[PDB]
Design a protein around this ligand. Structure first.
Ligand SMILES: NC(=O)c1ccc[n+]([C@@H]2O[C@H](COP(=O)([O-])OP(=O)(O)OC[C@H]3O[C@@H](n4cnc5c(N)ncnc54)[C@H](O)[C@@H]3O)[C@@H](O)[C@H]2O)c1
Ligand SMILES: NC(=O)c1ccc[n+]([C@@H]2O[C@H](COP(=O)([O-])OP(=O)(O)OC[C@H]3O[C@@H](n4cnc5c(N)ncnc54)[C@H](O)[C@@H]3O)[C@@H](O)[C@H]2O)c1
Ligand SMILES: N[C@@H](CCCC[NH3+])C(=O)O
Ligand SMILES: N[C@@H](CCCC[NH3+])C(=O)O
Lengths: 357, 347
């Protein structure tokens, strides 16, 4: 742990190479497996939920939030995801709405040991979480997926869920016609047929639904309370600003609701709409004991998804394992570790030339 | 767009090209101007920092410190306090990094060392406060704690006050005995002296210790020169203080960040209504300080992220001028913003 040590940086090209080498399906399966196992450890009391995430809300050019998401594994390392939600990014800047990075700090010394992209990782672990929850709460013969919001998360929602359920078709809606019209192309690699459908038809026909929209505060719901199939399972994934919800209260009030992180869901999930005592067991509890969801595949269920840093730490480990196996990334001395630990000015600039000019 | 990364080597090169005094002055100047802007209501204090307490190896904390300049950028310092680092690992107790994110898009635009930058802006803040609240003819500086921050407390204060000597103490004999050579570059003579003597002879003191919660105080509850000014710089865990209560309770106290001070500063010992005007208020109206040079004063320093934003800008200006640093594509920006898998080209 001496001063010599440096930070392992995985850039955009290294993350691409992991995907190419491992393959999209297998990478996602790995992340599903890792999350499943980690959530079960939480459910058994072996590990703790992450502290509540925090952020700085920004009103322009459309309201969004930039957040910090710490998770400590005592004695090992601290993970921090720094992540923005800026829902004008695609149309104004050609950038994703969700832009972030994930860092690892040594628990013992506090040294920054690794840093990587958070955009891909976030999309993957968020799809994976919906898959963990849906494998438990959706009918195992579910064939039709509904998606409300067909932006970036929708892509990994469909992908992840196609890996745990025998999906054959997706019925999809977005309030931006261009975004719903491009979804078939973005979704084609999954082999799942895509059709555009209005929310009322999605509600009526889907076996499982994911909502993942940039709906503004107080502008929900995004799925009307219009008649749904009895066994419907919904992943409510949209999460950013306090005040943002996507599901109608009438539906939520008659569902079995599992939150990823109950205290956080009550603040910024659909559980904003509910009292604490109406919540079913949390996702970690279901992972430790799937029968705590007994019977809930045949009745209305909702997985309230907010995202928490433990999920990022687990996904990051999957990337760092595959990247280490292929020798990827670079090492950069970012942090100053002075030769004399008590002398901040003990720096080492490049030596000066000796020869006469 | 890619992230501009300034590592230890680039930071060393800034110091070598600009020089230590000049770099410190720039930071003093930027902070003085920034704090005065806060004091006029043109800018605002950072939100309260947060952290994760760590019990081992000895109690420490790893913290996150955000600051937003709306429409411009967001700064985040991530910083550990791990006071076994020097002796166990040869690492500084304070280890961190500073990142900048575009406010509009969220994108990570710059990343740099936080170790040097922390020590500089922390010295600078004491200099800002001391120029206001110490006697202008102050000749004797006292330092309690002679580790990393002491070096920049001395340097910064030597630039703003006519200091002739530093009386110093550390509970680790090796740490006090090495201080004269770490300080030599400042031209201020160093003498090792016990806390009772430092308390009684200093014109200005900075306390900057890794004292544990429940340990200390680091000066005795004694009589002091009437005009004594103290910078209380140690700050880490909730619970941690350095000064005796009887000294604090008869001082005029200014905090860098009053809410933060009340939680993790000397002001943890005081009720909220005993804090006086904050540092930014004095910076915008130096006349409010001028009567308090001749009676006991304390600057309660915790550090806040605005200071890190300002110091980082100084470094980025100097680095751009010499085109230092590298560019790394860290964040994935997919060719289609709505397609996370659009990673093309595959390697
Ligand atoms: N739960 C988690 O772990 C997690 C993680 C990542 C992102 N998120 C959240 O998922 C949501 C979507 O993120 P993204 O990366 O897909 O954003 P995106 O901008 O790529 O896609 C969101 C889409 O929602 C559409 N939309 C807005 N209002 C709508 C409405 N009323 N009905 C239908 N569609 C609507 C937009 O037109 C856009 O296509 C955000 O709230 C984001 O913060 C959650
Ligand atoms: N802005 C701020 O106010 C700010 C910024 C950086 C660091 N700090 C804080 O300043 C303190 C010191 O940081 P550092 O980087 O110099 O750490 P360091 O470990 O380099 O030096 C601390 C020194 O304090 C000494 N010490 C411990 N207990 C003492 C006692 N009772 N009396 C005298 N000396 C004692 C130690 O032996 C050590 O040499 C920490 O609390 C740190 O978190 C505050
Ligand atoms: N400003 C709020 C945001 C909470 C997180 C919202 N997803 C906070 O820091 O507490
Ligand atoms: N655990 C506390 C620590 C505050 C920072 C102390 N200097 C928090 O997150 O609020």
């Amino acid at each position: 742990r001496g001063s010599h040590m440096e930070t392992w940086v995985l850039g955009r090209r290294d993350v691409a190479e992991v995907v190419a080498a491992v393959g999209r399906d297998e990478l996602m399966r790995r992340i599903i497996d890792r999350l499943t196992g980690g959530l079960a450890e939480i459910g058994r009391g072996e590990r703790h939920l992450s502290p509540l995430r925090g952020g700085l809300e920004r009103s322009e050019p459309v309201p969004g939030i930039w957040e910090w998401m710490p998770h400590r594994e005592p004695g090992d390392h601290i993970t921090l995801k720094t992540v923005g939600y800026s829902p004008a990014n695609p149309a104004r800047f050609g950038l994703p709405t969700i832009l972030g990075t994930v860092a690892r700090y040594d628990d013992t010394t506090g040294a920054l040991t690794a840093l990587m992209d958070g955009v891909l990782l976030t999309a993957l672990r968020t799809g994976a979480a919906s898959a963990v929850a849906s494998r438990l709460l959706a009918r195992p013969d579910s064939h039709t997926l509904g998606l409300i919001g067909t932006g970036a998360q929708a892509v990994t929602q469909l992908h992840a869920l196609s890996l745990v359920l025998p999906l054959q078709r997706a019925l999809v809606w977005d309030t931006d016609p261009a975004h719903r019209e491009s979804f078939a192309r973005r979704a084609a690699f999954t082999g799942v047929s895509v059709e555009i459908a209005e929310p009322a038809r999605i509600a009526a026909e889907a076996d499982v639904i994911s909502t993942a929209t940039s709906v503004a505060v107080g502008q929900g719901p995004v799925l009307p309370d219009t008649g749904v199939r009895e066994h419907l399972h919904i992943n409510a994934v949209g999460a950013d600003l306090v005040g943002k919800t996507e599901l109608p209260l009438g539906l939520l009030e008659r569902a079995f609701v599992t939150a990823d992180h109950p205290e956080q869901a009550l603040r910024e999930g659909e559980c904003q709409q509910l009292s604490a005592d109406r919540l079913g067991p949390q996702l970690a509890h279901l992972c430790a004991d799937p029968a705590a969801a007994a019977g809930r595949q045949d009745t209305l269920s909702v997985f309230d998804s907010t995202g928490f840093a433990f999920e990022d730490a687990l996904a990051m480990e999957v990337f760092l394992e595959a990247a280490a196996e292929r020798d990827l990334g670079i090492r950069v001395g970012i942090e100053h570790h002075p030769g004399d630990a008590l002398d901040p000015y003990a720096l080492q600039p490049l030596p000066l030339p000796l020869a006469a000019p």
